[PDB]
Amino acid sequence: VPTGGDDPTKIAMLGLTFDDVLLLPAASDVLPANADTSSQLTKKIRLKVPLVSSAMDTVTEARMAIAMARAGGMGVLHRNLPVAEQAAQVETVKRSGGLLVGAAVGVGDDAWERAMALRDAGVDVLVVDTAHAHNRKVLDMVHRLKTTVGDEIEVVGGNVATRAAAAALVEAGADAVKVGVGPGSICTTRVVAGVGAPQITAILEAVAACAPHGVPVIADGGLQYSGDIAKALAAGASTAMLGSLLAGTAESPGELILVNGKQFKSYRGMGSLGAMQLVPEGIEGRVPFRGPLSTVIHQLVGGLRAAMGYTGSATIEELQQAQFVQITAAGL
Amino acid sequence: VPTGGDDPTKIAMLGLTFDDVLLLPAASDVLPANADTSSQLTKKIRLKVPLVSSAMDTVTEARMAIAMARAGGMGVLHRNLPVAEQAAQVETVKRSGGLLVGAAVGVGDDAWERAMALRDAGVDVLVVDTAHAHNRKVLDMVHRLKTTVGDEIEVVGGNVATRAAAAALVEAGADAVKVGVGPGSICTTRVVAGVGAPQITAILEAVAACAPHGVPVIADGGLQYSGDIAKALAAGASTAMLGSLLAGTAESPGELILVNGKQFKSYRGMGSLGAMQLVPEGIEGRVPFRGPLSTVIHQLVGGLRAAMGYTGSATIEELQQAQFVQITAAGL
Amino acid sequence: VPTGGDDPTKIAMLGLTFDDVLLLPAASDVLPANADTSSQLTKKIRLKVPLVSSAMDTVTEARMAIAMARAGGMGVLHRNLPVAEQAAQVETVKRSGGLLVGAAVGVGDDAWERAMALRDAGVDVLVVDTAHAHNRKVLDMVHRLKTTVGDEIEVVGGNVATRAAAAALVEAGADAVKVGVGPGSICTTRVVAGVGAPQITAILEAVAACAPHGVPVIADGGLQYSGDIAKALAAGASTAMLGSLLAGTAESPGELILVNGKQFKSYRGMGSLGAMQLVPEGIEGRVPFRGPLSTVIHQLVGGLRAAMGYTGSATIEELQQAQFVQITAAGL
Amino acid sequence: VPTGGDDPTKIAMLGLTFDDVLLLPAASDVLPANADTSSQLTKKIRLKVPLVSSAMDTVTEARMAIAMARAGGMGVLHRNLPVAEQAAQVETVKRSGGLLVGAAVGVGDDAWERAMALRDAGVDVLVVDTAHAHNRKVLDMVHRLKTTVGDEIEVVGGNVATRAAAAALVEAGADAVKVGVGPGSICTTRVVAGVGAPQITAILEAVAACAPHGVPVIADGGLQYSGDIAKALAAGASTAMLGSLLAGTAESPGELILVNGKQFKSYRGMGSLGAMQLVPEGIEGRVPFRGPLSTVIHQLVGGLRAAMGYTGSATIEELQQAQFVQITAAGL
Ligand SMILES: Cc1[nH]c(C(=O)Nc2ccc(F)cc2)c(C)c1S(=O)(=O)Nc1ccc2c[nH]nc2c1
């Protein structure tokens, strides 16, 4: 083996990230303004805009979830607060019209009760929110939830980074599979644990397991530009979950911060020291203030529509069949 | 597939850009001063110098087009102004002697009338100027133009980045094919839409479709150094179109700008916010002031001549048969 | 041969370093808190924590060796001082309870007497400490030591970077093989001599020679983050030796340094000008002050435990069978 | 072809430079102090130290040539001055004992007379000094010189970057072949002409043509560290020619320069604007002042000796058979 040892499977793959690829233009009859951006969040739920906001306490509380749903996407409420408070945020969203909402639960002691309270509150999507869903504890939770409330509530499981892990969630009964181990902007899983999978390759691998079972893949983490959304969907994801890109918006939690004459908002990992208040796997930082969510979403969707125009994709389903070119370091 | 999924065509190619390759020296009897730099702009039109200026409102108006033609190249007049004004710039050039001139048209409402006015004004080359020529609307325009004024006017179509798109323009009747989706210095197509193709690979692919039909390829965008011109032509292009490299010249539109004791001129994408005055696919910036066009062209052609000396190329046609070595990140 | 010449063996391999790979998550029933971090330092000696401190005069004297052993690892005492002083540091450690300790010897004039004095002082591990163990002088020393004190003292040999060199040390009778030629943070072997081997590939190659003989590999040098420890062990090493990561600790030798309002400690190669007081193969620098060793070790082991959780590794032996994904420049 | 077009020979090779490779350690009985550093400069001339100074007017005049010869290497006198002055510098060196000296000539009008005057002055080596020796004008000069003064004077030809060019010089009768098109520190051939060849691959290719005919290769340009000398010789070169590494020495021409409290000397390409006093293919810069040549050479040779120790090379001939590992961007 050219890279060492005698085992060709030791280094199993070459992992590509968003900056490693570009979408190739293709024959097109599609104007960007006329493209159809709708896509499956889960087997049953279709969104007008294939974007969901991260279950983080500096991204999504009731305000964000309401704005996201009104923009045609959805918010996933974070779970870093008492169960009664999360359920109360679910209610607040549902009382603002017939708006879709999801909410994160863990696999811990009180996870099952949290889930039951959220259902009672009228939640549409339950997200089993973990760093590593390839764990019998996570797969059991996913299964237990689907068998209990599956008729009324869609159950998302995550996160995974390999084909085998996505396959296990599919078998456990997941209505969607969330992909991303290591790629988050505030993530230090890669440096702390040495663990991860570049996101384009992880999406391609997860989609190979999920698509044949009609299970949508949510691409979660590592998205920096609107063009990365197009790339994630062309790799086969059906939606993208955004943290950093939305953390600087008016609707996110947290106050405005002024440093050196410029405006910021705090953005922090759920595995950072201050969020857990131990070995942190996230940092605390700031992102530029971006103004209203509606503006940000408009530019993101605008970029998506441009990609759909370039690739001749009339629908997201068509975009998922687009081709890439791999680029070198010099490209960029 | 080592990079993910089971489809080997999903990532179709490894795209190389100018910084990824060097020209290999070869046996030579050619002195740089004696090389023949002439080359086909289109099937019918040969230039003394294989360089054309970009159809941008910070690069080419009448003054640039006159200087470019006198230097042995050609200018393509931008179309960001009323039809009567563009036609008046065409006249202004033709009244400055028997100088070649081209002019951009789009595919929009008034594109056909613009084209007719330009012809009446005496234009030599019509450039169907789009970000994505692989669109039936663009191919139709190219065809409609060639069938109407083809005897008197050469019709360029662009831009493309793939072999199939170049082939479609050839069949539509293009007299030259312009290559470049994503590589412009002021371009944000890559980050906004996630779409593009590294320019050496795009030229190689387009030339594979065009050369067998005797259709010249214009390499458009991404050229930073005189050595990049040599590389573009050795990849098989017949001419290079330059924006950034000429935007800092006395003959370009726009005034001199002083910042921190240094001289600049504004240079902006035609898809930037201020040029369109929406989801911009270009930025606005500045380039260093370079002095007279004649000086810049002299150094560019000087570099080209040096490359022709190193590669034993007596003509541009010979240079198109030169070989590359691929380099690594460390090289550079 | 695509890279030049006609000999495919001239460039024998593509060497990967820690930043070139990530650990892939795998099916897991392992909680980080419950993972077993114990591992073989040598054939006979198992540590509770697979970490040893570098035999450097800015890393390990008696204080460090005591702290390291109490934390479940071990220190290797540096040999840059009189033999009687090194032996006195060995005694000092052994008088602080039943704590494991090792000590470096060279291959020079007084190396054999140093070794004998260390044994008399009660040392547990002798480390034949060289930059290049593939030297008959080093192999002879290793052999001579093992045949003389082998029943009572474990003999480590190093350093190596190739499979053949590790194999030679195994045959010489080494109880562990230390891997790393070129990767140290303060190392200039690579720039001064042009010699080295990227550490993941060197570990994989050394383990291919050592593992079939039940000889543990110590990964020495180049480790920057806790995640690198996980990667080194997954490549097949049984322990990691740390210099830079521990040089900033309270227990390391040297005083606190204040520069620009921040706290540092000096950290220098044993082959630097000031350590040898000639052609230096190390530099002198500073690392940030890190506080007590116990804190640093806790975070390092925490990262290791996280990796074991992600990879489903209940033991270090299991972690050694984990898989990597190779990443590109863009990843990082 | 994965990188574009249908011609696999269009991109002929992947070119590696010094930073792309490391020397692999090997079994060794060689102490650095005992290695034999002597090597062939030409078929007939062996140097004690395999280093020659560049024929540049900021590197080698009489003073440098004398110091270089006394250190066991040789200087090549630059040709940027009247013929009588160059010949007078040759005399000055020969009058300082039985010291070897070489001198550059071109292929121009007065090149032949320059060569004759140098011979009369007692020169030992004539270097036909060009940027591209694969030119019948250069090959003719090499041949004409060898057939005229070949019994008394060794004739070097250069520069080349390909196997075929080296082969042509061998057939022309060169006593040594100098390799390097594009790699010089002050070189802009790569950016101006887009032409070049990464130096490790160029050396490997040139040696494939020269070694079977017993013709030594001089590696010229791109050497930044003493470790690069070892790498150049292990690729198969017999000597290295140094510009930047020696330009900062007391013995080089030019005065001391003080900027921001630090000491420098000017270092400039022979193809820079100021050296030619047009399309320059070199820049003018400064390098740090390094003190006496003897110190610099000592450290360079020290690094070489270290490499010989690591690779088990008792002679330069043995070092030429050493193996490399290719490294990634992350390595470094
Ligand atoms: C550090 C951490 N561990 C867990 C976790 O769930 N651990 C766990 C997993 C399986 C299990 F059975 C029992 C516990 C979580 C949520 C976190 S987090 O707060 O930092 N959030 C994320 C989310 C997504 C990520 C992708 N890469 N890294 C990520 C971190």
Ligand SMILES: Cc1[nH]c(C(=O)Nc2ccc(F)cc2)c(C)c1S(=O)(=O)Nc1ccc2c[nH]nc2c1
């Ligand atoms: C953003 C944009 N879209 C179009 C465009 O023509 N859209 C379109 C295409 C086909 C069609 F049928 C209908 C409309 C244009 C001209 C532009 S531009 O002003 O920014 N100019 C260019 C030019 C070259 C480029 C290469 N990569 N990106 C480029 C942008």
Ligand SMILES: Cc1[nH]c(C(=O)Nc2ccc(F)cc2)c(C)c1S(=O)(=O)Nc1ccc2c[nH]nc2c1
């Ligand atoms: C520069 C140097 N040479 C030797 C050395 O032992 N030389 C030698 C080797 C075999 C022999 F038979 C006779 C002498 C040592 C210890 C050193 S050091 O002080 O700088 N330490 C290390 C340690 C680890 C390294 C990995 N890469 N580089 C390293 C340097």
Ligand SMILES: Cc1[nH]c(C(=O)Nc2ccc(F)cc2)c(C)c1S(=O)(=O)Nc1ccc2c[nH]nc2c1
């Ligand atoms: C720019 C230039 N051209 C020539 C030259 O000889 N031209 C030429 C060649 C063949 C011929 F028949 C007639 C003329 C030279 C010397 C130079 S230089 O002054 O700049 N020196 C070098 C030396 C080494 C180089 C490697 N890459 N680039 C280099 C430049």
Ligand SMILES: O=c1[nH]cnc2c1ncn2[C@@H]1O[C@H](COP(=O)(O)O)[C@@H](O)[C@H]1O
């Ligand atoms: O603390 C953390 N460490 C690692 N990943 C996190 C952490 N907190 C949230 N994440 C994940 O990172 C995603 C956001 O990534 P981003 O959009 O690149 O900022 C989230 O949706 C989570 O999957």
Ligand SMILES: O=c1[nH]cnc2c1ncn2[C@@H]1O[C@H](COP(=O)(O)O)[C@@H](O)[C@H]1O
């Ligand atoms: O706004 C824009 N976005 C992307 N490409 C543009 C834009 N405006 C002009 N271009 C293209 O970029 C070329 C100039 O590229 P440059 O020479 O690298 O500066 C032009 O000839 C166009 O093809």
Ligand SMILES: O=c1[nH]cnc2c1ncn2[C@@H]1O[C@H](COP(=O)(O)O)[C@@H](O)[C@H]1O
């Ligand atoms: O001077 C030196 N030059 C090269 N390597 C050294 C030197 N001194 C110590 N080392 C090695 O570098 C290791 C520490 O590397 P680090 O943990 O990356 O700082 C040590 O354990 C030695 O193997």
Ligand SMILES: O=c1[nH]cnc2c1ncn2[C@@H]1O[C@H](COP(=O)(O)O)[C@@H](O)[C@H]1O
């Ligand atoms: O002006 C120039 N342009 C390109 N190469 C040059 C020039 N002048 C000298 N050289 C070459 O660069 C070598 C020195 O390279 P360096 O050691 O990397 O600085 C010289 O020996 C020449 O071969």
